[PDB]
Amino acid sequence: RFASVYAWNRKRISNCVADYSVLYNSASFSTFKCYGVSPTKLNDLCFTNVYADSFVIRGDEVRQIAPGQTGKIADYNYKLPDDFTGCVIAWNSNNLDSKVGGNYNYRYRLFRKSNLKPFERDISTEIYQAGSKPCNGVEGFNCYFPLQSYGFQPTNGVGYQPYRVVVLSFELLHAPATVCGPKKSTNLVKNKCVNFNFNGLTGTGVLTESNKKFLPFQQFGRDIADTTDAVRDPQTLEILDITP
């Protein structure tokens, strides 16, 4: 059971091994659009933090789940920032989220004073005031209940049928090493100009045994003028200098 679009769910991914190639080639998704990265380079990146937003919308409102869009879902239900990094996955779910006579468990907001911020969530249920007259907790002329309900019936045209949407969002803030595609931690070497990758840190140089006491909580070493000059090996947890 997914959540409604006006109060959407947000699952946060933790340290893992993620395989996005089995998602990109599942042949069951109606829309797989990545925005901040090419899809084929998904298996090799280490996103400090991954979030997943899951909800249910209509069929002709999937094109509003994109950075910089207009419409009632785009204005105030779910807003995507213009500098997006994750992907949008969307698939038809008429067999699951619809039933005969109408499935009214999926409400959406169609009245709000202002547009939403990106990643803003408005679960308020105040009575909207369309006109200049206040009504103070009752309906009437130009006083509306802000949440309508989707009428989901399986005898609907395609474009009025329930589409399940999952929006993945990746970010690379300051973490030391989080989730990441499946890779083989090939044996490390020393004292040779090498091409290395330390759970995200990509570089080149000679690796050497260190003697700098990396405080139990310091992922790496920063040098004035800001160039990486030390790392910590994730598996054995020892500090190594990176000479060029």
Epitope: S28, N94, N95, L96, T155, G157, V158, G159
Partner: antibody, heavy 123, light 108 residues
Framework: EVQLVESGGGLVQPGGTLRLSCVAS????????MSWVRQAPGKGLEWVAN????????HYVDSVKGRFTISRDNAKNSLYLQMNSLRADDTAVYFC????????????????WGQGTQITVSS | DIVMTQTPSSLSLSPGDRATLSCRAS??????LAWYQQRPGQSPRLLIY???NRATGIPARFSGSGSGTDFTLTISSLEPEDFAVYYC??????????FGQGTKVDIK
């Protein structure tokens, strides 16, 4: 291999009552959305009903409702369809149909039909 | 509710050539169409499910595709068992699940 044996069809009067049974062996009963599909003699195929891997949303064809009833039994690996007040136009060949897949999103495809039984309604 | 239509009714052919069959919907379905082969005196058999995807145990002579209103099944070389009736069926708009009408391919 998957086998879908079925029985119960025959000859009855307009206004009679029949009950078709259907036994499944090859796959693993339950989880599969079993169905029933008729075909008139000398015409194309049609559709009758389908239920669940349980009992829910029996889902008839709206030219039949109130006269047919589809049910199942997972312990006996059996599927039943009962017809009352036969309207002298439900003379056809009826087929037990499996549903080609295991999970609900890709259901709806009539994978692995069975051989059909014949029902004639006359006097 | 959806009136599926098979635009040729019968194709006279010779064993060995190709065979094209067209199914046209009355409403925009997308990718959700299957093709069944009613053999003479046998139970029907699912050839392709989901438009261009073949089912298990089906040889590579059968191909399909589409994504809207027009759909087409193609048989590369007619084996002598392939002279049968062919039905197209949608599954996105139910109840009811509507079939086509049949395209009896025979020998000539």
């Amino acid at each position: 291999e998957v086998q879908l044996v079925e029985s119960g069809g025959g000859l009855v009067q307009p206004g009679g009552t029949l009950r078709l049974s259907c036994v499944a062996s090859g796959f693993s009963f339950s989880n599969y959305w079993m169905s029933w599909v008729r075909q008139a003699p000398g015409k194309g195929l049609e559709w009758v009903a389908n239920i669940k891997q349980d009992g829910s949303e029996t889902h008839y064809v709206d030219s039949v409702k109130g006269r047919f009833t589809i049910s199942r039994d997972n312990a006996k690996n059996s599927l039943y369809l009962q017809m009352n007040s036969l309207r002298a136009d439900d003379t056809a060949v009826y087929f037990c149909v499996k549903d080609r897949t295991d999970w609900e999103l890709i259901r709806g495809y009539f994978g692995h039909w069975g051989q059909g039984t014949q029902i004639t309604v006359s006097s | 509710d959806i009136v599926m239509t098979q635009t040729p009714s019968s194709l006279s052919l010779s064993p060995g050539d190709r065979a094209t069959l067209s199914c046209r919907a009355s409403e925009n379905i997308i990718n959700y169409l299957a093709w069944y082969q009613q053999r003479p005196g046998q139970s029907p058999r699912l050839l392709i499910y989901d438009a261009s995807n073949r089912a298990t145990g089906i040889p590579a002579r059968f191909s399909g595709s589409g994504s809207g209103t027009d759909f087409t099944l193609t048989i590369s070389s007619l084996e002598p068992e392939d002279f049968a009736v062919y039905y197209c069926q949608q599954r996105i708009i139910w109840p009811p699940y509507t079939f086509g009408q049949g395209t009896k391919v025979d020998i000539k």
